[PDB]
Amino acid sequence: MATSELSSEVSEENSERREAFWAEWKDLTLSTRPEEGSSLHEEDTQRHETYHQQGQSQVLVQRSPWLMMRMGILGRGLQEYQLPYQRV
Amino acid sequence: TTQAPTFTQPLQSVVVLEGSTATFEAHISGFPVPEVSWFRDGQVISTSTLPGVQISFSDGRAKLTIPAVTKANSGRYSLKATNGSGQATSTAELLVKAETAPPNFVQRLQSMTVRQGSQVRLQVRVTGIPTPVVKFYRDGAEIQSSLDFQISQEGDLYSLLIAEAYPEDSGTYSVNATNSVGRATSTAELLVQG
Amino acid sequence: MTTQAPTFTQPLQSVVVLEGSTATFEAHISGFPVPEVSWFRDGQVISTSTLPGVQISFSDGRAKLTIPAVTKANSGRYSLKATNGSGQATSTAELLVKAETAPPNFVQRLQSMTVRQGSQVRLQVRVTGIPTPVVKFYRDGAEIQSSLDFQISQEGDLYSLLIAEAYPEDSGTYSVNATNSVGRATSTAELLVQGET
């Protein structure tokens, strides 16, 4: 329904050297898929019975300046990738 | 070299299920070691405003634990580190979701062929959060509980008791269960022999 | 031994993955006789002619479809259909393919420095991001257009601003700002050019 957008911020300063540093970024975005997105449906023509179910699933994608992403469906586990993404 | 506080790993957002444990964690470097303090929505954090919180800061590793979070706990969380050279703030969000689940039929309707004049009992078992709204239907028309067609609820077990079945009662019966995050449907066929 | 229509012991589950990595839909199935099994994308039947490299398997009641290297274009709904003489069963889940992105970061920060009138001075940063961040230099709040006067130049991911010869008028607060579609960052430092003594 409504995508959520979470932001993280960092603000550091050094008065001994007069140096500062800022940062703000789209840290975590949480989205909502429509139930039609993951459904199940079964027909038994021998016993004349049918079953149907559908449900929303919320996806979670996270990121960071330190080059590392995180993603998954909320309820299932998250997966962690190493940006500049390679292969094994 | 006195070294102003700095983050090698700042706070990062956290999403988590109502009732679970949420955890903010960050690594801080500096010298002399900073005085760290945590905030929520601008107000300082304490056992008083967040019952059961746990805090720790050893070996460059800062960590704040909230035991049994509740929706009301959502908001911006800050960590501040200072010392003679300077300071540092790292800010992140905590969003808590309701633990929800689409309607599920643990026991589904079942087709049955019976004898005219029989008592027939069709029953399902349904779970959901939020509680599903459950209704019964015959051939697309919603059934209205009554003495001849008795619908009753017992825990998460729903029942339709047809006192006296006849051939006019034959057809496709179905039960629909809906809630804010989904819906499920179980249909079966009832044959009444004359 | 017991003619039983096909039923998903465990439905398909939607998945989010990183463009370039492997994706797998998995399901467990029952029935007898054992169901014929087949897969679809957005209603269209799946074959090695529609999805080169796909690995499909179906044995021991467990059906698997794996895409070794997913692309953005693979996003869609995936259906596993199981058929047999007593009935039929379907399961649909989504595949969501996300691209690599990372907000600007300063792997090496601007650094305050004191120098002597007439020194060559180099202010340099090392910036990382995906997509590649746009980077700018500023002095006392105003942006610097690279020029003879202040030569800005990039060398790999390392950006630097050379002051051919430094003078007091050059003392001031410098800063670099890095932005892209997912975040921004700023590193500020100070430069002090010593006077005559």
PDB file of N, CA and C in Angstrom, chain C residues 8-95:
ATOM      1  N   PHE C   8      -0.102 -28.533  -2.877  1.00  0.00           N
ATOM      2  CA  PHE C   8       1.171 -27.967  -2.504  1.00  0.00           C
ATOM      3  C   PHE C   8       1.426 -28.160  -1.047  1.00  0.00           C
ATOM      4  N   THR C   9       2.371 -29.012  -0.720  1.00  0.00           N
ATOM      5  CA  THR C   9       2.705 -29.087   0.677  1.00  0.00           C
ATOM      6  C   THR C   9       3.322 -27.752   1.139  1.00  0.00           C
ATOM      7  N   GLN C  10       3.967 -27.015   0.236  1.00  0.00           N
ATOM      8  CA  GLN C  10       4.518 -25.696   0.583  1.00  0.00           C
ATOM      9  C   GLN C  10       4.610 -24.800  -0.640  1.00  0.00           C
ATOM     10  N   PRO C  11       3.763 -23.777  -0.711  1.00  0.00           N
ATOM     11  CA  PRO C  11       3.660 -22.926  -1.899  1.00  0.00           C
ATOM     12  C   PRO C  11       4.951 -22.212  -2.280  1.00  0.00           C
ATOM     13  N   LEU C  12       4.917 -21.545  -3.429  1.00  0.00           N
ATOM     14  CA  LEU C  12       6.040 -20.765  -3.886  1.00  0.00           C
ATOM     15  C   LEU C  12       6.122 -19.594  -2.965  1.00  0.00           C
ATOM     16  N   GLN C  13       7.295 -18.972  -2.895  1.00  0.00           N
ATOM     17  CA  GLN C  13       7.526 -17.823  -2.018  1.00  0.00           C
ATOM     18  C   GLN C  13       8.210 -16.741  -2.804  1.00  0.00           C
ATOM     19  N   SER C  14       7.681 -15.525  -2.767  1.00  0.00           N
ATOM     20  CA  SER C  14       8.264 -14.438  -3.529  1.00  0.00           C
ATOM     21  C   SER C  14       9.668 -14.181  -3.041  1.00  0.00           C
ATOM     22  N   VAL C  15      10.522 -13.671  -3.925  1.00  0.00           N
ATOM     23  CA  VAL C  15      11.908 -13.410  -3.557  1.00  0.00           C
ATOM     24  C   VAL C  15      12.454 -12.105  -4.126  1.00  0.00           C
ATOM     25  N   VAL C  16      13.277 -11.442  -3.320  1.00  0.00           N
ATOM     26  CA  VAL C  16      13.986 -10.249  -3.772  1.00  0.00           C
ATOM     27  C   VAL C  16      15.438 -10.589  -3.922  1.00  0.00           C
ATOM     28  N   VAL C  17      16.008 -10.289  -5.080  1.00  0.00           N
ATOM     29  CA  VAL C  17      17.427 -10.561  -5.274  1.00  0.00           C
ATOM     30  C   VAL C  17      18.180  -9.436  -6.006  1.00  0.00           C
ATOM     31  N   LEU C  18      19.504  -9.551  -5.960  1.00  0.00           N
ATOM     32  CA  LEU C  18      20.393  -8.551  -6.530  1.00  0.00           C
ATOM     33  C   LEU C  18      20.633  -8.840  -8.001  1.00  0.00           C
ATOM     34  N   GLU C  19      20.264  -7.898  -8.848  1.00  0.00           N
ATOM     35  CA  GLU C  19      20.573  -8.035 -10.263  1.00  0.00           C
ATOM     36  C   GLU C  19      21.955  -8.683 -10.367  1.00  0.00           C
ATOM     37  N   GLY C  20      22.100  -9.702 -11.201  1.00  0.00           N
ATOM     38  CA  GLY C  20      23.386 -10.349 -11.352  1.00  0.00           C
ATOM     39  C   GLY C  20      23.564 -11.618 -10.517  1.00  0.00           C
ATOM     40  N   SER C  21      22.714 -11.822  -9.513  1.00  0.00           N
ATOM     41  CA  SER C  21      22.810 -13.046  -8.721  1.00  0.00           C
ATOM     42  C   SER C  21      21.757 -14.100  -9.081  1.00  0.00           C
ATOM     43  N   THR C  22      21.800 -15.224  -8.363  1.00  0.00           N
ATOM     44  CA  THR C  22      20.934 -16.366  -8.632  1.00  0.00           C
ATOM     45  C   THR C  22      19.603 -16.244  -7.894  1.00  0.00           C
ATOM     46  N   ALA C  23      18.514 -16.697  -8.513  1.00  0.00           N
ATOM     47  CA  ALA C  23      17.197 -16.721  -7.846  1.00  0.00           C
ATOM     48  C   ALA C  23      16.615 -18.098  -7.941  1.00  0.00           C
ATOM     49  N   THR C  24      15.877 -18.510  -6.920  1.00  0.00           N
ATOM     50  CA  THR C  24      15.331 -19.853  -6.909  1.00  0.00           C
ATOM     51  C   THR C  24      13.921 -19.887  -6.360  1.00  0.00           C
ATOM     52  N   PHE C  25      12.976 -20.419  -7.115  1.00  0.00           N
ATOM     53  CA  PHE C  25      11.660 -20.663  -6.550  1.00  0.00           C
ATOM     54  C   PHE C  25      11.642 -22.118  -6.171  1.00  0.00           C
ATOM     55  N   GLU C  26      11.111 -22.449  -5.003  1.00  0.00           N
ATOM     56  CA  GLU C  26      11.007 -23.854  -4.611  1.00  0.00           C
ATOM     57  C   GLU C  26       9.637 -24.180  -4.044  1.00  0.00           C
ATOM     58  N   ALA C  27       9.192 -25.406  -4.300  1.00  0.00           N
ATOM     59  CA  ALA C  27       7.889 -25.886  -3.862  1.00  0.00           C
ATOM     60  C   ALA C  27       7.936 -27.396  -3.621  1.00  0.00           C
ATOM     61  N   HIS C  28       7.103 -27.896  -2.714  1.00  0.00           N
ATOM     62  CA  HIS C  28       6.996 -29.337  -2.490  1.00  0.00           C
ATOM     63  C   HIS C  28       5.589 -29.771  -2.887  1.00  0.00           C
ATOM     64  N   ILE C  29       5.468 -30.930  -3.507  1.00  0.00           N
ATOM     65  CA  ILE C  29       4.184 -31.317  -4.067  1.00  0.00           C
ATOM     66  C   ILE C  29       3.801 -32.751  -3.760  1.00  0.00           C
ATOM     67  N   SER C  30       2.500 -33.017  -3.742  1.00  0.00           N
ATOM     68  CA  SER C  30       2.001 -34.359  -3.488  1.00  0.00           C
ATOM     69  C   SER C  30       0.930 -34.673  -4.495  1.00  0.00           C
ATOM     70  N   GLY C  31       0.512 -35.927  -4.531  1.00  0.00           N
ATOM     71  CA  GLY C  31      -0.458 -36.363  -5.515  1.00  0.00           C
ATOM     72  C   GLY C  31      -0.161 -37.774  -5.973  1.00  0.00           C
ATOM     73  N   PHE C  32      -1.108 -38.360  -6.700  1.00  0.00           N
ATOM     74  CA  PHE C  32      -0.948 -39.674  -7.280  1.00  0.00           C
ATOM     75  C   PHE C  32      -2.111 -39.928  -8.238  1.00  0.00           C
ATOM     76  N   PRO C  33      -1.806 -40.319  -9.480  1.00  0.00           N
ATOM     77  CA  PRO C  33      -0.427 -40.483  -9.963  1.00  0.00           C
ATOM     78  C   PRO C  33       0.326 -39.170  -9.829  1.00  0.00           C
ATOM     79  N   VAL C  34       1.655 -39.210  -9.768  1.00  0.00           N
ATOM     80  CA  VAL C  34       2.464 -37.989  -9.666  1.00  0.00           C
ATOM     81  C   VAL C  34       2.107 -36.984 -10.761  1.00  0.00           C
ATOM     82  N   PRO C  35       1.914 -35.733 -10.374  1.00  0.00           N
ATOM     83  CA  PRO C  35       1.507 -34.649 -11.279  1.00  0.00           C
ATOM     84  C   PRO C  35       2.491 -34.341 -12.389  1.00  0.00           C
ATOM     85  N   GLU C  36       1.967 -33.868 -13.513  1.00  0.00           N
ATOM     86  CA  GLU C  36       2.808 -33.293 -14.542  1.00  0.00           C
ATOM     87  C   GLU C  36       2.987 -31.911 -13.979  1.00  0.00           C
ATOM     88  N   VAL C  37       4.152 -31.325 -14.207  1.00  0.00           N
ATOM     89  CA  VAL C  37       4.533 -30.058 -13.628  1.00  0.00           C
ATOM     90  C   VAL C  37       5.000 -29.130 -14.740  1.00  0.00           C
ATOM     91  N   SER C  38       4.706 -27.829 -14.622  1.00  0.00           N
ATOM     92  CA  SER C  38       5.129 -26.846 -15.625  1.00  0.00           C
ATOM     93  C   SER C  38       5.115 -25.402 -15.113  1.00  0.00           C
ATOM     94  N   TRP C  39       6.016 -24.566 -15.639  1.00  0.00           N
ATOM     95  CA  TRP C  39       6.213 -23.198 -15.157  1.00  0.00           C
ATOM     96  C   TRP C  39       5.860 -22.079 -16.135  1.00  0.00           C
ATOM     97  N   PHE C  40       5.461 -20.923 -15.604  1.00  0.00           N
ATOM     98  CA  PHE C  40       5.055 -19.757 -16.400  1.00  0.00           C
ATOM     99  C   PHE C  40       5.624 -18.430 -15.894  1.00  0.00           C
ATOM    100  N   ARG C  41       5.839 -17.494 -16.798  1.00  0.00           N
ATOM    101  CA  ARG C  41       6.090 -16.116 -16.403  1.00  0.00           C
ATOM    102  C   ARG C  41       4.946 -15.245 -16.952  1.00  0.00           C
ATOM    103  N   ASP C  42       4.349 -14.452 -16.092  1.00  0.00           N
ATOM    104  CA  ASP C  42       3.251 -13.605 -16.511  1.00  0.00           C
ATOM    105  C   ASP C  42       2.291 -14.339 -17.465  1.00  0.00           C
ATOM    106  N   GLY C  43       1.960 -15.588 -17.140  1.00  0.00           N
ATOM    107  CA  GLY C  43       0.979 -16.324 -17.918  1.00  0.00           C
ATOM    108  C   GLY C  43       1.564 -17.067 -19.110  1.00  0.00           C
ATOM    109  N   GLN C  44       2.777 -16.685 -19.504  1.00  0.00           N
ATOM    110  CA  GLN C  44       3.455 -17.342 -20.604  1.00  0.00           C
ATOM    111  C   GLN C  44       4.293 -18.529 -20.149  1.00  0.00           C
ATOM    112  N   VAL C  45       4.244 -19.604 -20.932  1.00  0.00           N
ATOM    113  CA  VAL C  45       4.933 -20.842 -20.605  1.00  0.00           C
ATOM    114  C   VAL C  45       6.442 -20.631 -20.678  1.00  0.00           C
ATOM    115  N   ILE C  46       7.176 -21.284 -19.779  1.00  0.00           N
ATOM    116  CA  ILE C  46       8.623 -21.116 -19.674  1.00  0.00           C
ATOM    117  C   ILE C  46       9.396 -22.242 -20.327  1.00  0.00           C
ATOM    118  N   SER C  47      10.329 -21.889 -21.200  1.00  0.00           N
ATOM    119  CA  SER C  47      11.208 -22.862 -21.845  1.00  0.00           C
ATOM    120  C   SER C  47      12.602 -22.253 -21.980  1.00  0.00           C
ATOM    121  N   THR C  48      13.583 -23.059 -22.380  1.00  0.00           N
ATOM    122  CA  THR C  48      14.934 -22.548 -22.598  1.00  0.00           C
ATOM    123  C   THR C  48      14.954 -21.653 -23.810  1.00  0.00           C
ATOM    124  N   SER C  49      13.798 -21.378 -24.380  1.00  0.00           N
ATOM    125  CA  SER C  49      13.761 -20.477 -25.519  1.00  0.00           C
ATOM    126  C   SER C  49      13.324 -19.104 -25.081  1.00  0.00           C
ATOM    127  N   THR C  50      12.714 -19.050 -23.911  1.00  0.00           N
ATOM    128  CA  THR C  50      12.277 -17.797 -23.335  1.00  0.00           C
ATOM    129  C   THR C  50      13.243 -17.339 -22.250  1.00  0.00           C
ATOM    130  N   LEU C  51      13.946 -18.290 -21.635  1.00  0.00           N
ATOM    131  CA  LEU C  51      14.857 -17.962 -20.536  1.00  0.00           C
ATOM    132  C   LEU C  51      16.133 -18.805 -20.564  1.00  0.00           C
ATOM    133  N   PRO C  52      17.052 -18.427 -21.446  1.00  0.00           N
ATOM    134  CA  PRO C  52      18.282 -19.194 -21.626  1.00  0.00           C
ATOM    135  C   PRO C  52      18.996 -19.366 -20.300  1.00  0.00           C
ATOM    136  N   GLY C  53      19.542 -20.561 -20.083  1.00  0.00           N
ATOM    137  CA  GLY C  53      20.262 -20.873 -18.865  1.00  0.00           C
ATOM    138  C   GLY C  53      19.399 -21.337 -17.698  1.00  0.00           C
ATOM    139  N   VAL C  54      18.071 -21.320 -17.840  1.00  0.00           N
ATOM    140  CA  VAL C  54      17.219 -21.734 -16.718  1.00  0.00           C
ATOM    141  C   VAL C  54      17.518 -23.165 -16.343  1.00  0.00           C
ATOM    142  N   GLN C  55      17.505 -23.455 -15.050  1.00  0.00           N
ATOM    143  CA  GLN C  55      17.651 -24.836 -14.597  1.00  0.00           C
ATOM    144  C   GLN C  55      16.350 -25.318 -13.938  1.00  0.00           C
ATOM    145  N   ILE C  56      15.690 -26.281 -14.555  1.00  0.00           N
ATOM    146  CA  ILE C  56      14.429 -26.771 -14.028  1.00  0.00           C
ATOM    147  C   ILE C  56      14.553 -28.228 -13.640  1.00  0.00           C
ATOM    148  N   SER C  57      14.001 -28.595 -12.492  1.00  0.00           N
ATOM    149  CA  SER C  57      14.083 -29.973 -12.026  1.00  0.00           C
ATOM    150  C   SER C  57      12.796 -30.338 -11.308  1.00  0.00           C
ATOM    151  N   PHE C  58      12.482 -31.625 -11.309  1.00  0.00           N
ATOM    152  CA  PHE C  58      11.219 -32.085 -10.783  1.00  0.00           C
ATOM    153  C   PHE C  58      11.322 -33.559 -10.419  1.00  0.00           C
ATOM    154  N   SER C  59      11.662 -33.810  -9.160  1.00  0.00           N
ATOM    155  CA  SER C  59      11.814 -35.178  -8.685  1.00  0.00           C
ATOM    156  C   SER C  59      11.754 -35.243  -7.159  1.00  0.00           C
ATOM    157  N   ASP C  60      11.283 -36.385  -6.650  1.00  0.00           N
ATOM    158  CA  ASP C  60      11.159 -36.603  -5.208  1.00  0.00           C
ATOM    159  C   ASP C  60      10.112 -35.686  -4.582  1.00  0.00           C
ATOM    160  N   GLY C  61       9.111 -35.320  -5.378  1.00  0.00           N
ATOM    161  CA  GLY C  61       8.077 -34.392  -4.946  1.00  0.00           C
ATOM    162  C   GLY C  61       8.529 -32.945  -4.838  1.00  0.00           C
ATOM    163  N   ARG C  62       9.817 -32.683  -5.051  1.00  0.00           N
ATOM    164  CA  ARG C  62      10.306 -31.314  -4.976  1.00  0.00           C
ATOM    165  C   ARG C  62      10.619 -30.764  -6.370  1.00  0.00           C
ATOM    166  N   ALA C  63       9.976 -29.644  -6.709  1.00  0.00           N
ATOM    167  CA  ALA C  63      10.113 -28.997  -8.012  1.00  0.00           C
ATOM    168  C   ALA C  63      10.945 -27.753  -7.833  1.00  0.00           C
ATOM    169  N   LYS C  64      11.924 -27.533  -8.706  1.00  0.00           N
ATOM    170  CA  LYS C  64      12.821 -26.363  -8.590  1.00  0.00           C
ATOM    171  C   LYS C  64      13.049 -25.652  -9.922  1.00  0.00           C
ATOM    172  N   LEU C  65      13.008 -24.322  -9.880  1.00  0.00           N
ATOM    173  CA  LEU C  65      13.382 -23.495 -11.018  1.00  0.00           C
ATOM    174  C   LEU C  65      14.399 -22.470 -10.529  1.00  0.00           C
ATOM    175  N   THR C  66      15.563 -22.448 -11.153  1.00  0.00           N
ATOM    176  CA  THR C  66      16.669 -21.577 -10.739  1.00  0.00           C
ATOM    177  C   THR C  66      17.185 -20.715 -11.890  1.00  0.00           C
ATOM    178  N   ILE C  67      17.361 -19.433 -11.634  1.00  0.00           N
ATOM    179  CA  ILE C  67      17.954 -18.553 -12.625  1.00  0.00           C
ATOM    180  C   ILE C  67      19.321 -18.152 -12.107  1.00  0.00           C
ATOM    181  N   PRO C  68      20.376 -18.721 -12.676  1.00  0.00           N
ATOM    182  CA  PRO C  68      21.774 -18.462 -12.244  1.00  0.00           C
ATOM    183  C   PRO C  68      22.145 -16.975 -12.141  1.00  0.00           C
ATOM    184  N   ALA C  69      21.884 -16.213 -13.203  1.00  0.00           N
ATOM    185  CA  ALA C  69      22.174 -14.779 -13.195  1.00  0.00           C
ATOM    186  C   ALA C  69      20.950 -13.930 -13.596  1.00  0.00           C
ATOM    187  N   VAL C  70      20.270 -13.347 -12.631  1.00  0.00           N
ATOM    188  CA  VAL C  70      19.022 -12.698 -12.991  1.00  0.00           C
ATOM    189  C   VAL C  70      19.258 -11.308 -13.535  1.00  0.00           C
ATOM    190  N   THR C  71      18.451 -10.908 -14.502  1.00  0.00           N
ATOM    191  CA  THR C  71      18.435  -9.537 -14.948  1.00  0.00           C
ATOM    192  C   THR C  71      17.142  -8.856 -14.523  1.00  0.00           C
ATOM    193  N   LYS C  72      17.158  -7.527 -14.558  1.00  0.00           N
ATOM    194  CA  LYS C  72      15.986  -6.685 -14.296  1.00  0.00           C
ATOM    195  C   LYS C  72      14.802  -7.164 -15.082  1.00  0.00           C
ATOM    196  N   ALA C  73      15.009  -7.480 -16.351  1.00  0.00           N
ATOM    197  CA  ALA C  73      13.912  -7.927 -17.208  1.00  0.00           C
ATOM    198  C   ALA C  73      13.253  -9.225 -16.759  1.00  0.00           C
ATOM    199  N   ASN C  74      13.894  -9.971 -15.865  1.00  0.00           N
ATOM    200  CA  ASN C  74      13.298 -11.211 -15.388  1.00  0.00           C
ATOM    201  C   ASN C  74      12.181 -10.968 -14.351  1.00  0.00           C
ATOM    202  N   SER C  75      12.097  -9.760 -13.800  1.00  0.00           N
ATOM    203  CA  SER C  75      11.039  -9.510 -12.816  1.00  0.00           C
ATOM    204  C   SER C  75       9.687  -9.924 -13.378  1.00  0.00           C
ATOM    205  N   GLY C  76       8.814 -10.406 -12.513  1.00  0.00           N
ATOM    206  CA  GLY C  76       7.499 -10.831 -12.933  1.00  0.00           C
ATOM    207  C   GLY C  76       6.922 -11.826 -11.965  1.00  0.00           C
ATOM    208  N   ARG C  77       5.737 -12.345 -12.284  1.00  0.00           N
ATOM    209  CA  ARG C  77       5.129 -13.371 -11.449  1.00  0.00           C
ATOM    210  C   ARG C  77       5.472 -14.735 -11.992  1.00  0.00           C
ATOM    211  N   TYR C  78       5.786 -15.667 -11.099  1.00  0.00           N
ATOM    212  CA  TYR C  78       6.152 -17.004 -11.498  1.00  0.00           C
ATOM    213  C   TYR C  78       5.142 -17.993 -10.976  1.00  0.00           C
ATOM    214  N   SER C  79       4.673 -18.883 -11.842  1.00  0.00           N
ATOM    215  CA  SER C  79       3.653 -19.852 -11.467  1.00  0.00           C
ATOM    216  C   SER C  79       4.147 -21.260 -11.687  1.00  0.00           C
ATOM    217  N   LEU C  80       3.892 -22.127 -10.721  1.00  0.00           N
ATOM    218  CA  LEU C  80       4.150 -23.535 -10.879  1.00  0.00           C
ATOM    219  C   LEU C  80       2.794 -24.221 -10.953  1.00  0.00           C
ATOM    220  N   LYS C  81       2.554 -24.952 -12.030  1.00  0.00           N
ATOM    221  CA  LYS C  81       1.271 -25.604 -12.234  1.00  0.00           C
ATOM    222  C   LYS C  81       1.466 -27.113 -12.166  1.00  0.00           C
ATOM    223  N   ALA C  82       0.644 -27.785 -11.371  1.00  0.00           N
ATOM    224  CA  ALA C  82       0.723 -29.237 -11.232  1.00  0.00           C
ATOM    225  C   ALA C  82      -0.600 -29.886 -11.637  1.00  0.00           C
ATOM    226  N   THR C  83      -0.531 -30.855 -12.542  1.00  0.00           N
ATOM    227  CA  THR C  83      -1.742 -31.455 -13.059  1.00  0.00           C
ATOM    228  C   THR C  83      -1.728 -32.964 -12.903  1.00  0.00           C
ATOM    229  N   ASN C  84      -2.920 -33.538 -12.789  1.00  0.00           N
ATOM    230  CA  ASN C  84      -3.073 -34.977 -12.735  1.00  0.00           C
ATOM    231  C   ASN C  84      -4.549 -35.344 -12.929  1.00  0.00           C
ATOM    232  N   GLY C  85      -4.851 -36.628 -13.052  1.00  0.00           N
ATOM    233  CA  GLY C  85      -6.195 -37.051 -13.410  1.00  0.00           C
ATOM    234  C   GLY C  85      -7.318 -36.699 -12.454  1.00  0.00           C
ATOM    235  N   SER C  86      -6.999 -36.375 -11.210  1.00  0.00           N
ATOM    236  CA  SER C  86      -8.034 -36.086 -10.223  1.00  0.00           C
ATOM    237  C   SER C  86      -8.250 -34.600  -9.976  1.00  0.00           C
ATOM    238  N   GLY C  87      -7.385 -33.779 -10.552  1.00  0.00           N
ATOM    239  CA  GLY C  87      -7.490 -32.349 -10.359  1.00  0.00           C
ATOM    240  C   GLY C  87      -6.264 -31.565 -10.780  1.00  0.00           C
ATOM    241  N   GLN C  88      -6.061 -30.421 -10.146  1.00  0.00           N
ATOM    242  CA  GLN C  88      -5.079 -29.476 -10.601  1.00  0.00           C
ATOM    243  C   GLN C  88      -4.733 -28.489  -9.480  1.00  0.00           C
ATOM    244  N   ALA C  89      -3.534 -27.921  -9.526  1.00  0.00           N
ATOM    245  CA  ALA C  89      -3.073 -27.035  -8.466  1.00  0.00           C
ATOM    246  C   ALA C  89      -2.070 -26.005  -8.989  1.00  0.00           C
ATOM    247  N   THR C  90      -2.213 -24.751  -8.572  1.00  0.00           N
ATOM    248  CA  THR C  90      -1.327 -23.667  -9.016  1.00  0.00           C
ATOM    249  C   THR C  90      -0.779 -22.839  -7.864  1.00  0.00           C
ATOM    250  N   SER C  91       0.427 -22.316  -8.040  1.00  0.00           N
ATOM    251  CA  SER C  91       1.036 -21.447  -7.047  1.00  0.00           C
ATOM    252  C   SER C  91       1.784 -20.316  -7.741  1.00  0.00           C
ATOM    253  N   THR C  92       1.563 -19.089  -7.285  1.00  0.00           N
ATOM    254  CA  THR C  92       2.156 -17.915  -7.913  1.00  0.00           C
ATOM    255  C   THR C  92       2.923 -17.083  -6.889  1.00  0.00           C
ATOM    256  N   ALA C  93       4.102 -16.612  -7.265  1.00  0.00           N
ATOM    257  CA  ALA C  93       4.904 -15.781  -6.379  1.00  0.00           C
ATOM    258  C   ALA C  93       5.615 -14.786  -7.271  1.00  0.00           C
ATOM    259  N   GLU C  94       6.139 -13.697  -6.702  1.00  0.00           N
ATOM    260  CA  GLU C  94       6.863 -12.735  -7.525  1.00  0.00           C
ATOM    261  C   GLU C  94       8.372 -12.885  -7.417  1.00  0.00           C
ATOM    262  N   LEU C  95       9.058 -12.353  -8.429  1.00  0.00           N
ATOM    263  CA  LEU C  95      10.496 -12.247  -8.447  1.00  0.00           C
ATOM    264  C   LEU C  95      10.770 -10.775  -8.587  1.00  0.00           C
TER     265      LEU C  95
END
